[PDB]
Symmetry: D2
Subunit: 216 residues, 4 copies
Amino acid sequence: SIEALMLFGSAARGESDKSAVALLAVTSGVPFSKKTEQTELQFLNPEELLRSASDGDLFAIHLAFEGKIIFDTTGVFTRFKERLVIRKDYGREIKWGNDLAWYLLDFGMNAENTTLVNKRIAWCVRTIAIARLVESGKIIFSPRALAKEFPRKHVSDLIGLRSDEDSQTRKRRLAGFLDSIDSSRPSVSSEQEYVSHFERTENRVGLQTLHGLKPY
Amino acid sequence: SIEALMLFGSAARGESDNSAVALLAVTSGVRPFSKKTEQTELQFLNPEELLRSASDGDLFAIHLAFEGKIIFDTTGVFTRFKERLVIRKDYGREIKWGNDLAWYLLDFGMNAENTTLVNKRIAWCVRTIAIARLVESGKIIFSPRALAKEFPRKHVSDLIGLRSDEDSQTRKRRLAGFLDSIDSSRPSVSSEQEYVSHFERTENRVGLQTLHGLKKESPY
Amino acid sequence: GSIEALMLFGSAARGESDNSAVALLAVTSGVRPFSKKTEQTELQFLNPEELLRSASDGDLFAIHLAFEGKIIFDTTGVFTRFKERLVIRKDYGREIKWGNDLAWYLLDFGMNAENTTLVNKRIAWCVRTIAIARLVESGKIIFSPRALAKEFPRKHVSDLIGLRRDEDSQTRKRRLAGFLDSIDSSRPSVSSEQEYVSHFERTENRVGLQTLHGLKNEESPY
Amino acid sequence: SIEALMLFGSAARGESDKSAVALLAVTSGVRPFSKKTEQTELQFLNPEELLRSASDGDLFAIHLAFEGKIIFDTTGVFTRFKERLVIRKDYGREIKWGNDLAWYLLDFGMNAENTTLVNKRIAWCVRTIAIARLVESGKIIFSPRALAKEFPRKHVSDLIGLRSDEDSQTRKRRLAGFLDSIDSSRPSVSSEQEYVSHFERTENRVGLQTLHGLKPY
């Protein structure tokens, strides 16, 4: 009862660096994912997949724009694309990525799990860049393209294109990026105030990341 | 030579209905042309023209990006094409072209001898308006079946060829009801000659071609 | 090592739905052959040397990959080198004897095992293997169980490959013996269970050894 | 109505050079025909003829089954096609067709004005012989690059287009060297009209089309 299968992410674009071969299996009933060192198999049911198109999620836009359908026995990917509404305002997603970037600058740069911190920083930077580009009417997901289409300080370094520095250097790059996009910290200081801010603004990835410390 | 090849149109969506199998060959240097049989359309573009259609945000380029099935691409030209796409907020230029031609056909085309071309061009006008309005609202709809559902205006289904042999009286009132249901206004013209010069001033190529086709743009 | 190439195979590559699992072959340098499964997906890994070796050996799995696999991507050309290495043999007697010999062990010691679904699965593997190998010897490229039953219409093949049902242990053993009779099969010169083990070892019947020890690097359906 | 579509030939192998982009369209009721531009070939067959080529074990059907990329298939006809394939043990008929046409081209065709067509037909003869011999040995090779390695007879890589603006006597010496190296024998013919009747009696369809046009996958 896997009714449809799609290649997405870097392999869909024909990229090979970094990345991770990503496949989306559409199956009724059951949203988990099983991954190895270089593979990732995501499962979604049709209601969830269509909901992400209805909501205009950046991930849905990527699937519609770059996903390669391997098979589809039910037409669920046709219905997915017919439900897609690309929004004109991604300010909510942009603010989520801005706010989490400040959290990581303020509290994450000496964390034990450096790999997770670097990956979430990359997510913040990609999210801001993709969403800003969607607002201007362009559909860019490739990290190489993002650095050229969203020219801001250290974008290439931060989304992993250029990655084994020390804490001071990583923090300065992230601060230079945030200054370059004229970003300002939310009205918080402590980690606990970041938690409350993430809750009020319903920043799910911020909350997942903050507690986790305790790409396509 | 042929750098890349893409299935587009109805066969790219798995539709076999009026089912023209359409393939886009990207070939360096060559002018844009097409070789077509009863059931196939093989269209040739060079990379510069393909990328320009993306830069321009052409409806056809949006279709290729969101529905085209890449068969092969030896140069990455379809990646560069998608990175050049700029979807506009305002498709009023295309909408007015289809609107303006629709009024021409209403006024002068419904008694024309070439009934087939008239009905084909009416369907182009309606599909163009429907697709453009849906793109303005953030959607990626191109299937004629979906256009009728997603752009639920008067007589859309009949006017884009979803059955097909109605007389001249009936076809004219359907077109009139559609234009009314989208709050369309006839351009400031009356005679056929005034349409010609209006079509020329507004650079309505399809309008001029159609008008100068009824005397003496295929769906994707 | 990185994933050079990815191929859809098995029932999903044939457009056949069910139960069946979606099977995918990932080619990656360095790693030993291993699989990663869910209820409905099977992800197999091979390095290029092992993939090319199966082509050079004319393995039935390699023939299936070459004639039915759907390449999802291939950044190194490894699947072309694979196809250029395939040598389809005239004689699959060795594969046929493997399926024959495991069938006789199952007939003799497996029909009352508690793990009945594994026994039925391995019976189906024996029949499919014999059918596929005989058809390849005659120049055909058949792997779909539906088509196997029509192209290799020996006794009870449809039922023994799972194209129906479940019934009692008696009828199952009767069906299996009748299929072995219809292909003029003779039991190998063994009697006890350890004699089957030694015979599987001498003949290098990897699936026979895996099955026998499994009833008290596995074969994957395609 | 086109019920299925398949990419074949060099493009299906991800091979470029110049070799056209080739697509096979399956549509019912029509007789076989093709539409060609300089760089595309669009071949039309009905299901019955496609299935028949598989039952006959034609080299073209082997290539479609082994290397063709299905673009769409609304009826399952490519499945029934592959179930009908019987790969033969003996490709002597096809080998003799390629040998015989090679002798015609050597003895009568090298002087045709349409040198481009002659070189293409020579390459067809050499590829057909090599492919058929390899299939007899259980190998499924269609790529010209690989045919030259796996069937290394005299001048093979030259003759299948991997080297070509050579004059007529040079190309002629190469073809003669190839035929001698595979111990080929001229048919017992001594004129164009005798070649026509020989091609007819041996049912050498490509031979007859070549001769008449003078006088891929």
